[PDB]
Design a protein around this ligand. Sequence first.
Ligand SMILES: CC(C)CCC[C@@H](C)[C@H]1CC[C@H]2[C@@H]3CC=C4C[C@@H](OC(=O)CCC(=O)O)CC[C@]4(C)[C@H]3CC[C@]12C
Ligand SMILES: C[C@@H](c1cc(Cl)cc(Cl)c1)N1CCC(COc2cc(F)c(C(=O)NS(C)(=O)=O)cc2C2CC2)CC1
Ligand SMILES: *[C@@H]1O[C@H](CO)[C@@H](O)[C@H](O)[C@H]1NC(C)=O
Length: 1114
Amino acid sequence: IRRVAISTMVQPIFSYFIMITILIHCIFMIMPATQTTYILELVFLSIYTIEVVVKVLARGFILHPFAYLRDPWNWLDFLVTLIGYITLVVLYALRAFRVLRSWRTVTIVPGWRTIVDALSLSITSLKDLVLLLLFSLSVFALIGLQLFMGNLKHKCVKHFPADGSWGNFTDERWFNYTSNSSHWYIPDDWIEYPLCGNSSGAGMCPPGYTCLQGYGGNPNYGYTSFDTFGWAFLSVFRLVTLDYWEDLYQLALRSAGPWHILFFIIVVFYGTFCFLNFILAVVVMSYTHMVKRADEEKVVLSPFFELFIAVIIVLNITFMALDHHDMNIEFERILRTGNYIFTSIYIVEAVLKIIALSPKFYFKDSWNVFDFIIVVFAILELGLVFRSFRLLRVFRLAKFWPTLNNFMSVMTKSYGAFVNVMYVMFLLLFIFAIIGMQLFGMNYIDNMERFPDGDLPRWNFTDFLHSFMIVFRALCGEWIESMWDCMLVGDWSCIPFFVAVFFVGNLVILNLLIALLLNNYGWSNIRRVCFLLAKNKYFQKFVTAVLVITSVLLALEDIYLPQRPVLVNITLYVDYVLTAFFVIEMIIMLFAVGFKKYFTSKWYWLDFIVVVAYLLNFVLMCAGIEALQTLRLLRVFRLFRPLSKVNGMQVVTSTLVEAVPHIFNVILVGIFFWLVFAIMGVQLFAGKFYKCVDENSTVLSHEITMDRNDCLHENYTWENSPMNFDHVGNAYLSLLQVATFKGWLQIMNDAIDSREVHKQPIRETNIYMYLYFIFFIVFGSFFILKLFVCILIDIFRQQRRKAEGLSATDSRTQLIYRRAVMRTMSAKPVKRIPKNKIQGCIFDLVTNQAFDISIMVLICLNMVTMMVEKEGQSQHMTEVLYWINVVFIILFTGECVLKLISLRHYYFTVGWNIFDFVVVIISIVGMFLADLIETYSPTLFRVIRLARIGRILRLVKGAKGIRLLLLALRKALRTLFNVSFLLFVIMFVYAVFGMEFFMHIRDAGAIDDVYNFKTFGQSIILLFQLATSAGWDGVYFAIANEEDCRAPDHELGYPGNCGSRALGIAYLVSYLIITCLVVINMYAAVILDYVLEVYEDSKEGLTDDDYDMFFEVW
Ligand SMILES: CC(C)CCC[C@@H](C)[C@H]1CC[C@H]2[C@@H]3CC=C4C[C@@H](OC(=O)CCC(=O)O)CC[C@]4(C)[C@H]3CC[C@]12C
Ligand SMILES: C[C@@H](c1cc(Cl)cc(Cl)c1)N1CCC(COc2cc(F)c(C(=O)NS(C)(=O)=O)cc2C2CC2)CC1
Ligand SMILES: *[C@@H]1O[C@H](CO)[C@@H](O)[C@H](O)[C@H]1NC(C)=O
């Protein structure tokens, strides 16, 4: 028995048989259930029970150190088997988790131990992060609850008619009229009522309407609001994750006023740019530790011929990229003839290499066999669809391109780790897809009526393909909208599902992929006086002040400027003065540094360009020609030199300057890969996004209009989608939209509906085209776009070493020891004298630990009391809460008074005591003045009452892990501020230029009455939104329009309302590259460096707390 049990278990055939059974079961889970699937379920269950029985007989159940149930994997198998028995012998929800067994398959891929251990270690080390996350989210939720309670219910209600149609006015007749939903303003074809508010800059009502509150529901089926603490918590989490956050941003600002942008700036800065980077750092350290442990464990054959082939390949790629939709016959002929020629040259090349070089030698080389495969593919394609394989030719460019060659070599060196990570990602997605299918599949069918038109949404859980796609979209970072649909047809269970999917997929697996990439990819008198003046500090300060003031003046040139003649005169005179000032400054600098030194530096070249532009404007004005706004806007570029000289700014600017070349290389490689995908997409979807629409832009059924001819016969419109794959340029723009996950849903919808050219698209007739996007996203977004952050992380590490004076040749341990040695020097103790008998007794009582624990409990209770407030609460509830808070204030004041008596003048030696003292004073004063302030603006009352939250911030005091993380943040504050300062300056430059370019465009897409480029503030609102790439497709659609817009009339002074496609493309693409992909990623770099240092101090060295403990006994 035992002999047989042990012997059978140890056989590899046993494990292989079980694993193959699991894989077959996985296949059967995908297809819809039938009777055959049922009998298969019994067979599979029997095999699993056999395995469990054998293992128990060999080891034993639990009672010995090496028993069956002493292994976590055995625990998983045991639980799944029991649940299968429960579901067969006797709720439908428990049977989904059978799929969990598939996790075992991760052991097939060699090297899985490293990745699995890295995942487990990352999960274990996120303990200290989760508590700080929950605390910060709750604080932000309370702030938002105080700020926006009930704001999302604002609506424009028609005035009570004065004609008497509804009857003579009465209070209840007025309430009846206003409560009717048919009197709330909503544009035709809209789903949501627009928001409003009477604060300056908020949404306005049409004539005959008034902005009221407390009517109807909140946006998004009522799931988006700040009315209760729970909903506020959900909104704050969404905002921190940047999940469709521009919608909430726009709703809140339209309802409350533009100033509330401040709230969003804080949450985004602290939540997104700092905390998520803490998670990234923790994952990176986990992976690095695991890899360290694993590693420690342990004619033709002439250059000219090659050059000729290289140019032939380049020409061939150009020809392949010139294919487009509706080509003329001449273009077709040229492209086909070139293809024939290129194929002939390749064939001749192959034969020549086989003759000059030995066939054995030829086929010994890898590049040669690749070329031969291309040759046979070309012959097969021309003989007889195999045109897709033509793309292989492009990869031949890697041989002659050193950068691409090196990139591919690095990819090949450590492929096993990438295979493991991708397999884990796909297995997790598969498990979640099966679970969600079982949990929510029938809800969509049964409760279809609840959807807006009673129609099934594109994204759902009906079948395996849709479930996989929806969970994959969640992993990409979009989860809240799917969760809204799930709740709409389902229940609360949707919330834990999606959140889990977002947490594991995006914050761990994707960050682990980043860690992998990081680990792998990484007269004499005149001269004298001019020189003395130039080197003088006062002169430089005066120049900087002039530049700053004039740049600030540039911001006042908004749409209303013509209505302010005084401002017009001030601007013109300042222009003249600036022209003179620039000329004089240039002469002085030339006299000081000389011609060679002046004309060999980049900063002086920028100054010179500004001078030349202003002189050109001067002559134009003299001649009677209107000044060029673009030229006179060039002076803002003078702002970067003083900015670069700001304290602590050197590290940031030096890092960016050093990273520039690597960024260029990454962009080139990305352009190549995106070209491959763009050619493929043009071949797949060129000319297939046309559809038939009527007077209202609504797509007709394929039944009424089968194709274009019917569409035109009924006098319908055959229209193209704005984003398409008609030619390579359009494909590039569409792929940029796909990679950033902004506007991608429309593109994918058009793709999966596509049919043959000149045929009405049908819903989901080509579903498998989803695959094309998946691949692109994996190789274009998860791999290529993440190289920028790796580059910045490495370069900032080097530059910060430079700034502190550290040596590049020193090792990690030496720096740990050097830091310890530096710390040991500075340390001084102190003692407090016990009090006199009564004062001394109080001293002992307060100095006890139980006192502080009690205070912490009181802080938690006060926080809960704050969490109870909700919109529409009763007045009695309001009074009760006020009195509870008063009692808490009295207790805290007593604690402070007792500490003051106990510690006398020593009380103020500790900073936390000063914070607590200030909080106590604020609390007393507010408790006294609450009614006076409220009775004698509601917005002002809410904002000032925010100070009440100060006395729950004392909860962080006393913790350990939170203290360590906060120490890292405090150590990095200067650099984070400098990065933000640079970001704001870039935003300012873009704001003035965007105001010049797009201030008169017509309302379309994301541009409307409230959000536009008409003023500096509105431009900044939009640009802050776009710094995260949020909603850049809608802005592009607004600013790039050139259709159905009237041209400017100089004679009549009409400015025009037309957009510009080229200008909009340049503007938005450059902004996305500069901010989203570079400057923002500096945050990650900074955070990672500092966090790592602190952790290495705590683990492999000494920390300040260690010295404090040593001096505690001293
Ligand atoms: C140095 C870094 C770390 C911080 C940069 C400071 C910003 C927070 C400041 C700079 C410019 C400010 C903006 C300047 C102009 C406006 C317009 C203002 O709204 C109005 O124009 C009110 C009048 C109306 O809406 O009718 C709202 C504040 C806002 C967006 C300001 C919000 C705060 C901003 C972004
Ligand atoms: C400068 C002075 C000042 C300002 C001005 Cl403009 C005029 C004067 Cl004369 C004085 N500030 C200082 C800050 C104060 C902050 O405000 C609160 C503080 C609170 F702790 C509570 C509270 O705890 N509430 S509770 C019991 O929990 O319900 C509530 C409030 C708000 C006021 C209701 C307000 C007074
Ligand atoms: C709202 O007003 C319309 C028109 O007067 C009326 O038909 C409708 O019944 C009203 N709504 C309710 C809920 O009575």
